Symmetry: D3
Subunit: 251 residues, 6 copies
Amino acid sequence: KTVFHLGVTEADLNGATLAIIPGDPARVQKIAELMDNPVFLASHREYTVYRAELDGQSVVVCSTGIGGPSTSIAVEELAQLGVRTFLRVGTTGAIQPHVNVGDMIVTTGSVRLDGASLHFAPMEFPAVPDFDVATAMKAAAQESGATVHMGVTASSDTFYPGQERYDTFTGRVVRRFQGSMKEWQDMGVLNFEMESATLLTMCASSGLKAGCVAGVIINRTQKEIPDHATLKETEARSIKVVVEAARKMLK
Amino acid sequence: TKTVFHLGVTEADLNGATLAIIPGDPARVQKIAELMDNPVFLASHREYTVYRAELDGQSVVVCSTGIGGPSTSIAVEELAQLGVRTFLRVGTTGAIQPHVNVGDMIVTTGSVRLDGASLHFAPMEFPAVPDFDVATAMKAAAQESGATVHMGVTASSDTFYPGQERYDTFTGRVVRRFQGSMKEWQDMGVLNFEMESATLLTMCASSGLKAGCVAGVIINRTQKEIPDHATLKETEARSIKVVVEAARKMLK
Amino acid sequence: KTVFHLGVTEADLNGATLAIIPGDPARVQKIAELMDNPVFLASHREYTVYRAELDGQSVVVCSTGIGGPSTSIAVEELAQLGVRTFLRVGTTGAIQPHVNVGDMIVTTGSVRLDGASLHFAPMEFPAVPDFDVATAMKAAAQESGATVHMGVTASSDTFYPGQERYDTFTGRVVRRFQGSMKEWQDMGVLNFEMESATLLTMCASSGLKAGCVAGVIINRTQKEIPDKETEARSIKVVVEAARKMLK
Amino acid sequence: TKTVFHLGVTEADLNGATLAIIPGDPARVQKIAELMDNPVFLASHREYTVYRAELDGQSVVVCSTGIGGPSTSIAVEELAQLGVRTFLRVGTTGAIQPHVNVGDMIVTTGSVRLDGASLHFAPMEFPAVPDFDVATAMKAAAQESGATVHMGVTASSDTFYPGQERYDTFTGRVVRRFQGSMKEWQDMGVLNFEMESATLLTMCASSGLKAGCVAGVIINRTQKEIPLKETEARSIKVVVEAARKMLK
Amino acid sequence: TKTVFHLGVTEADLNGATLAIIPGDPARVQKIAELMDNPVFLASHREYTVYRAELDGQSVVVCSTGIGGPSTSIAVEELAQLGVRTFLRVGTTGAIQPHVNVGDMIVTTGSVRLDGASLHFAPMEFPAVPDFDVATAMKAAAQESGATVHMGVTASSDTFYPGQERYDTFTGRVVRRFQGSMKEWQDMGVLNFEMESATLLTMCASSGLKAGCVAGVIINRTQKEIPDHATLKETEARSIKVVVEAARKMLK
Amino acid sequence: TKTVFHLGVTEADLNGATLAIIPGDPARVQKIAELMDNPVFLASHREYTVYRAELDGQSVVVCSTGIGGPSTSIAVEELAQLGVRTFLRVGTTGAIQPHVNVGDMIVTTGSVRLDGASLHFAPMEFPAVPDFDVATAMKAAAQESGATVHMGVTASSDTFYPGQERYDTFTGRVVRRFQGSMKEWQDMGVLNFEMESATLLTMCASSGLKAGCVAGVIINRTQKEIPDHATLKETEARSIKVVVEAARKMLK
Ligand SMILES: Cc1cc(O)nc(O)n1
Ligand SMILES: Cc1cc(O)nc(O)n1
Ligand SMILES: Cc1cc(O)nc(O)n1
Ligand SMILES: Cc1cc(O)nc(O)n1
Ligand SMILES: Cc1cc(O)nc(O)n1
Ligand SMILES: Cc1cc(O)nc(O)n1
Ligand SMILES: [Cl-]
Ligand SMILES: [Cl-]
Ligand SMILES: [Cl-]
Ligand SMILES: [Cl-]
Ligand SMILES: [Cl-]
Ligand SMILES: [Cl-]
Ligand SMILES: [Cl-]
Ligand SMILES: [Cl-]
Ligand SMILES: [Cl-]
Ligand SMILES: [Cl-]
Ligand SMILES: [Cl-]
Ligand SMILES: [Cl-]
Ligand SMILES: [Mg+2]
Ligand SMILES: [Mg+2]
Ligand SMILES: [Mg+2]
Ligand SMILES: [Mg+2]
Ligand SMILES: [Mg+2]
Ligand SMILES: [Mg+2]
Ligand SMILES: [Mg+2]
Ligand SMILES: [Mg+2]
Ligand SMILES: [Mg+2]
Ligand SMILES: [Mg+2]
Ligand SMILES: [Mg+2]
Ligand SMILES: [Mg+2]
Ligand SMILES: [Mg+2]
Ligand SMILES: [Mg+2]
Ligand SMILES: [Mg+2]
Ligand SMILES: [Mg+2]
Ligand code: NA
Ligand code: NA
Ligand code: NA
Ligand code: NA
């Protein structure tokens, strides 16, 4: 069978039922090459797709683009082609003083500051990961030697006002989001990103297994501009971790 | 030095406890406490019966919540004022999936917020999620008891009747919001209904408290057969054995 | 035949079609003994049930527990057993400076700060008492010599943040409820409690008659935490209101 | 002193009135005023016609509201600026219960807020509830007139057509929110539909003003969609007697 | 043959008109009608005064709406039942932007739905948007008059007082939703407040009817100076001249 | 050097451009740029490919948005930080009206906000509407190309599948909110579906930026999902010529 956007067929996946889904198309090859026999399948729009083999089993690596909407297309179309387990890796900004740049976060639930999640389940439904995937991600992250936090992630449809950034063209933030950083901090939320609410809600309500692991590249209470060597090390460890989490999920 | 308004206990009464087991039914409090060492009755007011006990040398509180988020929210708050930081809920549930059997255990990984009290702690966007350590301890304890364990989403309703799409009622009416809702939750993979977890999990996850929920399955909306009496007795006993073992794992 | 939670049958109620529904199971016997031939029927969880006779007619007294959810179960199961009129009594915190401890309030409508009401009617629907019950409660309260206020009650699913209390473990209140006590005060709301929105909405949308009378035990302009007489007077009033509802 | 922006009257014009009767139709204002003593025309602008009269020696205002919450909210606000504290709404209505007959009276004990203006005074959780004294006076006046009187909940809609689930319309369609709504309100025991009570009652109950509504039934929606003389005449006699009871 | 319930007119009374000019004030109806040929009084009931006239030989209806979406919705519906398909709203307005002057005209490109009646036609997500041809005709007519014309967003409120964040009122109270709202709309570029456009535009755009709104500015929430009688008289007269010219441009 | 977080370009790179053409697909950026003078590649990062070109002597930037409001919102914000004030969206769309044929063009006059990002700029009541000059320019350019052009409302969804009521999916399920929604939008006169306009139009209209959307119809949902290749190619080629001519009209 074919799909509308991803440009791959079921045959291209060689029986893969697990996908690693980074955001950045450029990260796809980097992840694939941590496994055996990486093969470029397709690139169209924000969707770059590779296959590789992990302990003899086919695994697909597919970028999502930025945001719930583009993520939702990739997950749906991969599911049409037989994928049932989705491991999200990406970078994130921490909002708690105790979470340091270079730490890792495994999301136990997401604050749904998105729109696409509502296209799968009403707001009352929890944006939570599959327990096996979260468990595998925690184990892989801890085994790497990283400092790992389990907790709630705020997942926003914007990078700017929905994360209460004021250093912008207008410098304004709509009422809903004024004072919101402080509120999430007080409620113990660890970090911000832009895809987990959609991913987790879609999967948890559709019989798909999903989880999210992230490297902390900035801390909002500190500075916006990351140090290059620190960022590189964090990014490299994250992709090693997500591949090990995939290994733990294979049956 | 204060005595909290509803529970009628003081901090000193808890002998340093930082963990509470919180069943719904006041009559179950003594039953849980007696699985531990040196159980002592502290107080009973309204739906709140409170005992203390000792588990591997550490003080633990057992406190009933009553039915529903509102009465649960009072117990959790007043215990937190007195130093309790971890809350392990144990209780009965009805399953709504055919693959879940009477006698099985469910550990909630997140709750559908069909309640009102959760909104008094966090807006609806916030996830009603357990602490990961508590959920992990509950899964391990449940598996070690020999039970079949399901991890998944629980629908947490402010009513027993229309919010669980029951029609066998005085009016036989279910408001628009809840018509067809059972099938919707079933199709979304929800395991069960109960009436306190959304409040508990949202309150704790947004307030720096650790919480989780484990439940023995005593009825299944999709199975017409009458649950076996012996199985029910065994399930009640196993549930509370499991929650005490989960507490042991949290205090280690 | 025997309802799921309350542990009583229709026969146990001896034809009663009116219930007095306090919150605390311990107050059930106290109310029943204000009437004739009180009989203990059952106790389970927060639900203690008695029957008694008032001017020769059977009346039920049944506790609700705290909150809309446990209240909704009691009302439903009593209705299954033939009860059609529900008189809520309890205590409350006033938020207006002119409403004093010891005064009584009869709710004319509730601010729906609960969840269970939404399981019976959408938010647009008014949480309002049956007019005959409200009329009987006002008459009973006034005839007792009490100072009586008719007005709006804020009915909250929490005792703490939803009533904008800050002497709490977190010492914080979510955005929705920050500044809310002053807002309700400005809007003329009289008091806070925790069951009326559920009770009134459920009954007004289900062909049941309900109302709420409450004795004031704290004024929130004075302090947050409450410290016998007000309770005793309140239950005498609700029994007289029941007398007025009997046909 | 000031002349209010829309109503075109001053506080002095009202001769100390603290109670207003507020029908919808400007043409009804003189008809209500003439049931009292010394009626005098004060002003007419847009849908707002204003008279003063005397009832048992006390000044009373009669002021039309126009159709809907928005125009009602202006009249109530401006009258309150000029000292009015009690508002008695009279009008006609469509019943949705089969046992409520044309010619019956309804006194609203609470309104379903199917309007927008109520939200400009209180959030949706707040009850659209009358003042208890006004509702009590209206019930007594209605009964004393010999009318069959119903106390209960009224659905108060910002539209006459889709919000009252009428289908004999240009589009013949009703938006999702209102499809099946008449049956739902019927099942919930709602008595009737009209268009101003949610705004009036919410505004007043949240602003330290006393308000109530009484209405004569001119159609039963179990019978037909499209709808009077004797019902209107009896309704205004009733509201004037309710006013008398409030001034005593 | 039927006579519509509120407006008190029949289809035959409209003499084939498919376009209506809909001012708010019943007293303005005759004034607009007299700008055209052969004006004829049809009916007056409540806030609804109805005239017919002829514009370049074609029948045009002029019908007042009263204040607010609810009364407007009745007029539009009943006129549509009688064959009217195009609705041109005219009035005068204040403005909330300092660059908009008394005497300028505003053509609404979209409305902030601070009303209730719009929701009786379409859910809140739906845009309160004019028909493009009507908006185009109104802009052309307004500009041809020599006035400075602003195309932009209008805030359409179910109240004159709290929904426009007015504090000079009986209570001085503005509910939370509307506290700080004026500044918010100003910062978002909203031009003005009025009380009917959200209902009108949403109703029509979701019902196969063509609608638009044009207004002369009579006050500005942000300027010190008070406009003189002459400017206001000129603005009122220009607004109705403009709407009649917009009608001319819409005729086929 | 003024820099931005995602786009990888500086203000200097844009050579004073105040207008951007913003297609969805990065591959379409060079195709649009080459219709103008001196196109130069600036950067490519993630879904964002950026070129500069010159149109009648004025610098213009072409920048892809990616799929969806969230990625669109980043591009628009960062371009605005670098001085861009006018945004012309071009793309493809699926029509839902039987009278709107494959190969026609649509200029959006307002969007149904079935997205989340719009709410991060303005509450739901605010209209997702284009700048009137941009919409006018797009209509003229589209007409001048010989296309059949429709002006009207567009449904703008955060999903391609359930939010557009597609059932031929992995689960075959559509959440309650969206069941029956296609028919509802059809009945309300909505022309088409796409996934970025609600965010774009709301963000810009509430932030002092001018925006509009023009689209070629590549499928009609009442017909078939699989486009014919030659027809699609013709439609896509015409759309990019049209958006460049609309830009010319805006800069005149
Ligand atoms: C990397 C990153 C940082 C940040 O602050 N927010 C989001 O969404 N992503
Ligand atoms: C035990 C049980 C069963 C059921 O179906 N629902 C709830 O809340 N509890
Ligand atoms: C007795 C009481 C007092 C108070 O302040 N609030 C509630 O809910 N109950
Ligand atoms: C008179 C009347 C009748 C009816 O059915 N609805 C409304 O609003 N008014
Ligand atoms: C004339 C005018 C002015 C203003 O400020 N608001 C409304 O609705 N109308
Ligand atoms: C091209 C296209 C077609 C369609 O049906 N929907 C969306 O969003 N885009
Ligand atoms: Cl990434
Ligand atoms: Cl229990
Ligand atoms: Cl009590
Ligand atoms: Cl009643
Ligand atoms: Cl006190
Ligand atoms: Cl009238
Ligand atoms: Cl009839
Ligand atoms: Cl006018
Ligand atoms: Cl006439
Ligand atoms: Cl249009
Ligand atoms: Cl594109
Ligand atoms: Cl091309
Ligand atoms: Mg602000
Ligand atoms: Mg799952
Ligand atoms: Mg005690
Ligand atoms: Mg239904
Ligand atoms: Mg936590
Ligand atoms: Mg705050
Ligand atoms: Mg009733
Ligand atoms: Mg008697
Ligand atoms: Mg027809
Ligand atoms: Mg429908
Ligand atoms: Mg009052
Ligand atoms: Mg405030
Ligand atoms: Mg249209
Ligand atoms: Mg055709
Ligand atoms: Mg065709
Ligand atoms: Mg359905
Ligand atoms: Na994207
Ligand atoms: Na309870
Ligand atoms: Na209709
Ligand atoms: Na009006």
